[model samples]
Target chain A: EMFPSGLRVLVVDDDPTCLMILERMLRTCLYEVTKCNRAEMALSLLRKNKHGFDIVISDVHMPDMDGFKLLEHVGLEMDLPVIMMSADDSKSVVLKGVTHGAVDYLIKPVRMEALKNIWQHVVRKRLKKPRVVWSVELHQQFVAAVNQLGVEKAVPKKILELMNVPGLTRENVASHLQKYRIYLRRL
Target chain B: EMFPSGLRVLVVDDDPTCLMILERMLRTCLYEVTKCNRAEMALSLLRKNKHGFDIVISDVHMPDMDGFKLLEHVGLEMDLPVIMMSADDSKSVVLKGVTHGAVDYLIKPVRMEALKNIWQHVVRKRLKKPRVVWSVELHQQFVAAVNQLGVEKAVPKKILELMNVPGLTRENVASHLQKYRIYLRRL
Candidate 1:
C-alpha cells in the first residue's frame, strides 16, 4: 500500500486514560503522537505550528473545551483534519461533530484495530493531492447572493473568514477572493 | 474573495419546471447547472464520471432510486457531498438525510438566498478540509453492554442511532449515555 509511517499526530483529550490508550495504539501504528490533556494547550500547539500535525484525534466531551467547539476551532483556523470521540454516543452529538467539520466520530471503548483502520484511510487520503481553489467569479456571485439575501453579510463573511476562506467579510467578500481563498474550494 | 465560480451542479428531480426554476436561479448566481429528470440517467452520469461533480443536490421523493439511495451512492461510493431537499419538510425525512450522509436537507420552495448561502458555505467547507475518519468504540461497548443486560445488540444500535442524546429511548432512562458508559466525558 506504500503507506507512510511515523507521521505526526495530536491526541487531545481531558482524560489521562484516553491519552494513554490512544497514544499507545498510535505508537503501534508507528505514528509520532503528541498528547494534550487540555484544549487550551492543544490550541496553543496548533497556533504555534499549524502545519505540524497530520491528524487530530479529540474527545468530544472534554471538560475545558467540548469536542464540538474544539472541532469548530480546528475547522476554522487550522488545516488539520479532526476526528471526535465521546462516551456520549447520541446521534445528535455525533451529528454535531459532522456539522462542525469532523471527518468521523468514534464511540468510547473503540477497538484499537478499528482506530488503526481509520487512521490509515485518513492519512492516505491526505497524501492524495492538494485542495482545489474556487474561481474568482464563483466567489463574487456567492457574495452577491448572500448580500441579496439580507442575511447579515457580517455573519456569512465572518463564517468564511473563520473557515479560512480567502477575502471574506461583510463588505469585502468579493474582493477577498483575490487572495488565496482558503476553505471554499471543492475536493 | 475567490469563490469557486461556474460550479457545474447536477440536480435530479422529476419535475421539469422545478429543474428549470432551480437551474435559472443557480445560473443567476453563476453556477453551471445540469438538470436530470430520470434517476437512471442520474446514476449513469454518476457512474460515468464519479468525481466530475463538486456537489449533488437531490430531492427526497424521486420516483425511482429515491433520494435515500441516491445519497447512499454519492456518499459511500463516490464520497461526494450531497444536500437532499424535500417538500414534505417533516422531521423524519430530515433525519433520514442525516443518516444517509446528506449534510443539509431543505424544504421545497426553498429561498434561493438560503440555498445559495448553504451551497457556498458547504462548498467552502469541503474545500477547506477533507473529512477525517474514526471508529466509535463506545458504540461497540454499548452493544456488548446491552447484550449483557438482556437487550439485543441490533435493537439498541438502531434506536441509539436515532433520537436526541437527552431524549431517551426508554423512560426512567433520562439519557442514553448514563445507561451505556459509566465514565462520562462532558461535552
Candidate 2:
C-alpha cells in the first residue's frame, strides 16, 4: 500500500534530543519538518502565516507554558491538528492535554509504529474525510451551577449527565467539553 | 422537556484545594457532593455505602494512587458511574482515562456548565440502560460488581485475585451472588 505524501509538520519540544529524533524519523517519511524550542515563538510563527504548517507535534511538559497551553492557543487561532508527547505516565497530564485541545497524545520512548498509525488515522479521518460537526449541549442549569459553585465538584457530575443526551455525536461531545478548558487566548 | 433532578456525587482527589473548589461548584446544581482525598479511602466509603452514589468523580494524578487505580478498584467493587479529571490536559490522559474505565474526563480549573450538563445526561441513561459488557478484562470487574452484589461480596474479590488477574468481573462469580441479582433479593 502506498502512504500519502506532501505533509508539512511542526515540532515543539524543549529537549533537543527528542527534536532531533523526530526530525530524523519524519525525514524518512518525506515530510517537511519545522522545529521550535519555545511554544511562544511557535505561536508567533504560526500566526504570521497560519496555513503554512499542517500538523503540530509538541511535548506536554515544558517550561514557560506546556503543550496543553500551546494547543489551547492554537486551537482558537486555527483548527490545525496537534499531537502531544510525554515522558511521564501520569494520567492527569494526559487527560488535561486532550481535554484542553491536542488531537492525539503518545508516551515517551516514542514508538515509531504507533506514531505512524496515529498519523495515518488522523490523516484519513480528518484530512481525507468530509468535515462533519457533532455536538452535545450542557443544560443552562448546569452552567448556572458551575458559575455559582466552581468546576471540580460540580463539573464531573454534570459531565456524567451530559453523556446521556441521545443522538449526540462524540465530536459534539468533545467540542462541548472543550468550551471549559482554561487558557484559550484571545487575540 | 422535563429533565431529571437530584444526584449524589462523590469527588475524590489527593489535592484538598481542588476538592474544595469542585465541591463548591457542585452545590450550585443542588447536588449533594461528598469529597475524599484518596482512591483507597473512596473505595472503602463506597463499599460502606452499598453503592448509593449516583456518580464518582476522581482526579487522574495522585501520590501512591491515581485515577486508573481508583477505577480498577471501583469497577470490581461497585456500580457507580466514574468521571476522571486531571490537570495535565493531554489526549493520552483522556483516552486512557476513558479506556481504563472513566465514562468521561474534565480538564482542571473545572468548567461548571459543561460538567453539570454531562452529569444530567449520564444519570438519565444509566437509569434505564442495560449493563455494558466491556471487551477489556479489567472492565469486566465493573460488570461483575454490578452483576454479583449480594450473595457473597467476597466471591468477586476472590475470583479477581485468583486469576492472578489483579482484576475480576461478575461473568462467572459465585452462583449465589448471581442468583441474588436475578431474584432482586439480598442473600
Candidate 3:
C-alpha cells in the first residue's frame, strides 16, 4: 500500500547513527536505499549514475561539502528532488532550503510521520512528465525548411524531412507551424 | 521567513465547521483565505478571478461535487495545486489522491503541522518560471526573412524588422539563428 514500491532513495549524512536510522526507516517503507557518508560522495555518485535514485535525502551539515551545494547540484544539474534534514530548524535555514529547491526540510531526528508526509510530494513529482525546451538551433532548422518548401507546402511532415534534426518529430513541427501561422494572420 | 506571507488559499468543504476551522488556520498562518461551501462555487470563483488563489484545499466527501471531481477540474483544466482531505485514511484513497495530481492528502481532523509541510511545495511551484514555446507560423516568417536577406545578411535586427511578430525580440531571433547555424554545420 506504500508508494515507495521499488522507489530508489539516496540517504546522505556524516553522522553514522542518523544515516543508519534513515536507511532502516526507508527500507521498512519498501524503498531501495543507497547510503553516502559525504555530500561530495553523493554528488559523484549522482553524476556517475544519473538515473540511479528517484529522490535524495541529505543532511544539512556535512564536512568537505555542504547540503546547500549538494542541493544546488541536484536542483540545477540533475533536476531531482532533495529532502534536506538538519539539526537546526531555524527560520533562515528552512527558508534557504525551500527557496533553493529542497523539496522539504526535516528537523533531524526525523520521525516516521514526517517521512509519510513527504511521500505525496515524491509521488507527484515522479508522475509528472518532463517538458521539452526548443533550442535555437532546432528553431533555425525549422525556419530553413519552411523557407525552402514555401509556406502552404511546408507542412510539418515535409519540413521535418528537410530539417532532419535528430529526435525531432512531426507533431512538434506541426504545432510550431500552427502557432507561426496564427502570428502571421495577426500581422 | 515563512513562505505563506501574502499567499492566497481557497478552502472548500460541505461542512461549515470544517470550512471555518480551515479558513481560520490559514488566516492564522498569515495566508489570505477564501471559503467556499461547494466545489462548484469554488470553480466559479476560480474562473472569475483566475489568479486569485495560490493553492486549494478541499474535502473529499462533499454532497454536491466530491473533492476528486474538483481535483480533476483544477488539475486538468486550471493547473493549480490541490490538497485533498478525507475522514478515511485508507491507502487506496491516499494513493489515488497523489497519483491524480493532488499535491497532498490530509486525514480528517487536520493538524496545523500537516499544513506546514505543504508550504514548500507551494513555494517551489511559485518560484518556477513559465517557458515560452515557438509556433510554426513564426518559423515560416523567420525562414522568409533569412531567404530575402541571405543567411549572411539576415541578422536578428534585419529579421525582426521584416517578420515584425509582436513580442518577437532581436535576442529571440538571434538565438534561433545561432542554433540554426549549429544544426546546419551538423548536417
lDDT tens string, model 3, A1-187?
A: 5455668889899999999999898888778899999766676566446568788888887786656766655643345777888888876786556444465667876889776555554564421112334443454455557767876777777887787666566766776565344222221
**Tens digit per residue, CA lDDT, model 1, A61-157:** 6777566767756642343567777788775666466556555666888887666755542444531211222232333344344434443333555
**DockQ of all predictions against the true structure, Cα-based:** 0.02, 0.01, 0.02
- Evaluated at residue A111, the lDDT of candidate 1 is 84
For TM-score, the strongest prediction is 3
Q: Which stretches of candidate 3 lie over 4 Å from their true place?
A: A1-173, A176-187, B125-187
Where model 2 places Cα greater than 4 Å from the true spot, the runs are: A125-187, B1-187
lDDT of 2 by residue, A20-43 (tens): 988777877777789998876676
- Give the number of colliding residue pairs in candidate 1: 19
Give per-model TM-scores: 0.35, 0.36, 0.39
Docking class of 2: incorrect
Candidate with the larger TM-score of 1 and 3: 3
Which tens-of-lDDT digit does each residue in B1-187 have in candidate 2? 5444567888998888889888888887777899988665675567445447877888887565656756644532233567777887675665566445565567877887756764542444432211222323534343344434432344655544543443233343443234223212211
lDDT of 3 at B17: 85
Ranking, DockQ, top scorer first: 3, 1, 2
For all candidates in order, the CA lDDT equals: 0.57, 0.57, 0.66
